[PDB]
Amino acid sequence: GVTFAARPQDHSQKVNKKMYRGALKSILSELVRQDRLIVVEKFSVEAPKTKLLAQKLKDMALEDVLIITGELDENLFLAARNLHKVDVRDATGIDPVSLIAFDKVVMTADAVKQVEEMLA
Amino acid sequence: MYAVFQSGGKQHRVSEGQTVRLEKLDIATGETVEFAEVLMIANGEEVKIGVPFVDGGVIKAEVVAHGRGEKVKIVKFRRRKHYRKQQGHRQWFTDVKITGISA
Amino acid sequence: AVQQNKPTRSKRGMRRSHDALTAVTSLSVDKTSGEKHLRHHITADGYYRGRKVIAK
Amino acid sequence: ARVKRGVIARARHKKILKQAKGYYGARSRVYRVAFQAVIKAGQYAYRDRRQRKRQFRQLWIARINAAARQNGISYSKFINGLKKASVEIDRKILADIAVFDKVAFTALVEKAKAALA
Amino acid sequence: METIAKHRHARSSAQKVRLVADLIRGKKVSQALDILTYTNKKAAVLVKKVLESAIANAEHNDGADIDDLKVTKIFVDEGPSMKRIMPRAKGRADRILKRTSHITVVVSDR
Amino acid sequence: MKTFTAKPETVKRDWYVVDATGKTLGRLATELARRLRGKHKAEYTPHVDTGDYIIVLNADKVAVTGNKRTDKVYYHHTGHIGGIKQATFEEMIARRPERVIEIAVKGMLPKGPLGRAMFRKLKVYAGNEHNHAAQQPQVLDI
RNA sequence: CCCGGCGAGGGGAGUGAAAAAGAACCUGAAACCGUGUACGUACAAGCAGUGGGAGCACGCUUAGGCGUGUGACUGCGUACC
RNA sequence: GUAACGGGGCUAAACCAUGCACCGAAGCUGCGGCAGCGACGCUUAUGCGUUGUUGGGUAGGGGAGCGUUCUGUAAGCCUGCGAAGGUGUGCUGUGAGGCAUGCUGGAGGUAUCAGAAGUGCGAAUGCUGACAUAAGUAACGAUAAAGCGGGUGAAAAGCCC
Ligand SMILES: [Mg+2]
Ligand SMILES: [Mg+2]
Ligand SMILES: [Mg+2]
Ligand SMILES: [Mg+2]
Ligand SMILES: [Mg+2]
Ligand SMILES: [Mg+2]
Ligand SMILES: [Mg+2]
Ligand SMILES: [Mg+2]
Ligand SMILES: [Mg+2]
Ligand SMILES: [Mg+2]
Ligand SMILES: [Mg+2]
Ligand SMILES: [Mg+2]
Ligand SMILES: [Mg+2]
Ligand SMILES: [Mg+2]
Ligand SMILES: [Mg+2]
Ligand SMILES: [Mg+2]
Ligand SMILES: [Mg+2]
Ligand SMILES: [Mg+2]
Ligand SMILES: [Mg+2]
Ligand SMILES: [Mg+2]
Ligand SMILES: [Mg+2]
Ligand SMILES: [Mg+2]
Structure with missing residues (x-):
């Protein structure tokens, strides 16, 4: 055998809610201080085509970015599932690790309202 | 003619044009140094120190380079007592060429 | 009856030093057959000191 | 995760055997014996770096005593003569002089005589 | 020219060879x-x-004239050992090593 | 800089003659072992034979004090059964008188190869004249 | 194609980028066993080293000797847990 | 086996008393360097200039590090103009170690900062595989016995007649 064999162990830590929310407040403030955050009103496209999405990101001069929405669009999520450097998410489903990892973050203004309401 | 002097807490006999390794000094590379604490000058006829530090005696020397010596090992070991250490050391040296001998 | 330490390569050489082969290098040539053989021993061709035996 | 040990073990063993080249037999070939003799070599190194000073000083004193008795005086009276003549020449340089230039040593002896009497 | 010949897995001890x-x-x-x-x-x-x-091999594959030829290099390395059981007394057994050799002979002229 | 060490292909050795008419054994072998080892030369070196060659003659006429002519006993053992052999001083004088000088010098000299090699430089004879005139020997006074 | 016993095994040719990848087959360490060269050893004793150091043989050059391999001789010196 | 100074050896090289020298250790001092603890000023232990002081150490307490495997950084970097592993050399630091490269090898390795450990072996008459040792030593298995000519065959005391 092994001298001390391994067991299926849960590595789930416990995160305090205020610590989590303060980390997110600080992480977005540091994104703004790094000038890595852009806010617009509308961001969508009415066809499920990665060609159109990549052309729009070229027109916006964007390479490794993070999309967040007010509410979620069928074609927008379909157009960036297959794009590795781009993740499209609802404003509820956020993580600080992907808030760091992607080079710039772009936000719907309704999503900004939902985030600032959700943090308070 | 040869000279005997005191440099690094260690006395040294030298002739004129000889290269001598010594301890570390704060002097630069191309700077000329002097020594007025000479103990002995000799020829067919010699002049030694009676009391130390020869009157007219001076040694002019030129620093050539600085460096660190050959690395040596330090091993400490107590048998049967569960204790051993090891260390390493290199000693800083300055190489000089002895230019001038004067009395 | 058995040892208490392990012997060496050097001891093994010092013991095997004399256990080494000495060749003959002293061969004799038959006059008649024009071949060589051991001294006092016959050829494969039935010759010894010139004269003749079986030569099978 | 599981970690294997071969490369790092081979590195340490190879380093000790590198330090133990030129030793007799298993002292050069076998870790369990070479690792002892390198540590013992460290002990003897740590000792003999001190003992060089004693051994060379008694060599120097032997040569000075020999040359002083050649010039007609003892080592003890000679060193006392140098201390009363206020002479700070050490035994390394005095040994080198007493080998090479005899006449300089003879003059130093004469100064020690004049400082003694 | 050095010319090599060798015998692998010879059924005898390299000490003897x-x-x-x-x-x-x-x-x-x-x-x-x-x-x-x-x-x-x-x-x-x-x-x-x-x-x-x-x-x-020297005569055939390369330079001939056997009369101008000397034995130059020879070395007998040890080879693999066949490990057999020998039944000894009182139920015990001992390993037996049928030791083999690699016989190599290099021959050349000058 | 490196302090001098004698070199055995550079060693200038000399030759000496010691009269041993009536001298003291220990005090003589003192000076003998000194001159053989090379404690008198300023280019002494502890691992190089830097001494000189010494010819001692009239080795039968060495003096000792007290009753050591009678009571001082030289012992040696063979290696055998009870093989201890003793001999007095005058027994060594009658048997082989050079043995006294040779054993005393060998005892004063170190143990080992360099001791035996510098012991080789000691030549002792019982008479007054010898067959070593070709080396130009100088008289040692003591 | 050759030696060898119509063998085992091997030297050439040859395939292949590679045969010191030739079926015991990628890489091929160490113990152990050989071959060649250099140096030392056949009046000299003991944890086999360390420190000093003569000689020998190579490799560098500012050409003074710094470097390596060896270690005659000598002080000290009774392994590890 | 002398064997009751370590020895040689000594009528001083022994003993009593006196003086001046000298040797003699990793102690003390001189030089050059490292670290800790203070105490100081610019300044914030980031450091710099001194200066004082300390630095044998088992069980054991504390503080700081190196190296290996895997995860994120990593659809980035190195790599067939040659990676990991293997063998040598040179350089470097107090240290565990690191760096550059020759040769071998022939397709993978991973900076930096974090993170999780089956994480560092000489030992336990430890376990497994291999390899020496005595050593070419003992033995070759009932002391019922073998000798010769021919044949086969590369070669025959044993096989066949
Ligand atoms: Mg080796
Ligand atoms: Mg001794
Ligand atoms: Mg074949
Ligand atoms: Mg194999
Ligand atoms: Mg293979
Ligand atoms: Mg000899
Ligand atoms: Mg000893
Ligand atoms: Mg242990
Ligand atoms: Mg003193
Ligand atoms: Mg001291
Ligand atoms: Mg001190
Ligand atoms: Mg200091
Ligand atoms: Mg400490
Ligand atoms: Mg790997
Ligand atoms: Mg056992
Ligand atoms: Mg085992
Ligand atoms: Mg036999
Ligand atoms: Mg036997
Ligand atoms: Mg037998
Ligand atoms: Mg038998
Ligand atoms: Mg039988
Ligand atoms: Mg029959």
Whole structure:
């Protein structure tokens, strides 16, 4: 055998809610201080085509970015599932690790309202 | 003619044009140094120190380079007592060429 | 009856030093057959000191 | 995760055997014996770096005593003569002089005589 | 030209074979064959076959004139060992090593 | 800089003659072992034989004090059964008188190869004249 | 194609980028066993080293000797857990 | 086996008393360097200039590091103009170690900062595989016995007649 064999162990830590929310407040403030955050009103496209999405990101001069929405669009999520450097998410489903990892973050203004309401 | 002097807490006999390794000094590379604490000058006829530090005696020397010596090992070991250490050391040296001998 | 330490390569050489082969290098040539053989021993061709035996 | 040990073990063993080249037999070939003799070599190194000073000083004193008795005086009276003549020449340089230039040593002896009497 | 011949997995101890090889290391080929012929051992038989193979390989594949030829290099490395059981008394058993050798003979002219 | 060490292909050795008419054994072998080892030369070196060659003659006429002519006993053992052999001083004088000088010098000299090699430089004879005139020997006074 | 016993095994040719990848087959360490060269050893004793150091043989050059391999001789010196 | 100074050896080289020298250790001092603890000023232990002081150490307490495997950084970097592993050399630091490269090898390795450990072996008459040792030593298995000519065959005391 092994001298001390391994067991299926849960590595789930416990995160305090205020610590989590303060980390997110600080992480977005540091994104703004790094000038890595852009806010617009509308961001969508009415066809499920990665060609159109990549052309729009070229027109916006964007390479490794993070999309967040007010509410979620069928074609927008379909157009960036297959794009590795781009993740499209609802404003509820956020993580600080992907808030760091992607080079710039772009936000719907309704999503900004939902985030600032959700943090308070 | 040869000279005997005191440099690094260690006395040294030298002739004129000889290269001598010594301890570390704060002097630069191309700077000329002097020594007025000479103990002995000799020829067919010699002049030694009676009391130390020869009157007219001076040694002019030129620093050539600085460096660190050959690395040596330090091993400490107590048998049967569960204790051993090891260390390493290199000693800083300055190489000089002895230019001038004067009395 | 058995040892208490392990012997060496050097001891093994010092013991095997004399256990080494000495060749003959002293061969004799038959006059008649024009071949060589051991001294006092016959050829494969039935010759010894010139004269003749079986030569099978 | 599981970690294997071969490369790092081979590195340490190879380093000790590198330090133990030129030793007799298993002292050069076998870790369990070479690792002892390198540590013992460290002990003897740590000792003999001190003992060089004693051994060379008694060599120097032997040569000075020999040359002083050649010039007609003892080592003890000679060193006392140098201390009363206020002479700070050490035994390394005095040994080198007493080998090479005899006449300089003879003059130093004469100064020690004049400082003694 | 150096010309190599060798015998792998010979059924005899390299200790026994080097006793034969130390006779003819450095000698000429004709005297070497004569010494092996009138030396009375199993390894001498084997190394005589190897040496005749070396002669023929040198004569055939490259430079001829056997008369200008000397035994130059010879070395007998040990080979793998067959590990057999020998039944001894009182139920115990002991390992048996049928020790083999790699016989290599290099022959050249000058 | 490196302090001098004598070199055995550079060693200038000399030859000496010691009269041993009536001298003291220990005090003589003192000076003998000194001159043989090379404690008198300023280019002494502890691992190089830097001494000189010494010829001592009239080795039968060495003096000792007290009753050591009678009571001082030289012992040696063979290696055998009870093989201890003793001999007095005058027994060594009658048997072989050079043995006294040779054993005393060998005892004063170190143990080992360099001791035996510098012991080789000691030549002792019982008479007054010798067969070593070709080396130009100088008289040692003591 | 050759030696060898219509063998085992091997030297050439040859395939292949590679045969010191030739079926015991990628890489091929160490123990152990050989071969060649250099140096030392056949009046000299002991944890086999360390420190000093003569000689020998190579490799560098500012050409003074710094570097390596060896270690005659000598002080000290009774392994590890 | 002398064997009751370590020895040689000594009528001083022994003993009593006196003086001046000298040797003699990793102690003390001189030089050059490292670290800790203070105490100081610019300044914030980031450091710099001194200066004082300390630095044998088992069980054992504390503080700081190196190296290996895997995860994120990593669809980035190195790599067939040659990676990991293997063998040598040179350089470097107090240290565990690191760096550059020759040769071998022939397709993978991973900076930096974090993170999780089956994480560092000489030992336990430890376990497994291999390899020496005595050593070419003892033995070759009932002391019922073998000798010769021919044949086969590369070669025959044993096989066949
Ligand atoms: Mg080795
Ligand atoms: Mg002694
Ligand atoms: Mg075949
Ligand atoms: Mg294999
Ligand atoms: Mg293979
Ligand atoms: Mg000899
Ligand atoms: Mg000893
Ligand atoms: Mg242990
Ligand atoms: Mg003093
Ligand atoms: Mg001291
Ligand atoms: Mg101190
Ligand atoms: Mg200091
Ligand atoms: Mg400490
Ligand atoms: Mg890997
Ligand atoms: Mg056992
Ligand atoms: Mg085992
Ligand atoms: Mg036999
Ligand atoms: Mg036996
Ligand atoms: Mg027997
Ligand atoms: Mg038998
Ligand atoms: Mg039988
Ligand atoms: Mg029959």
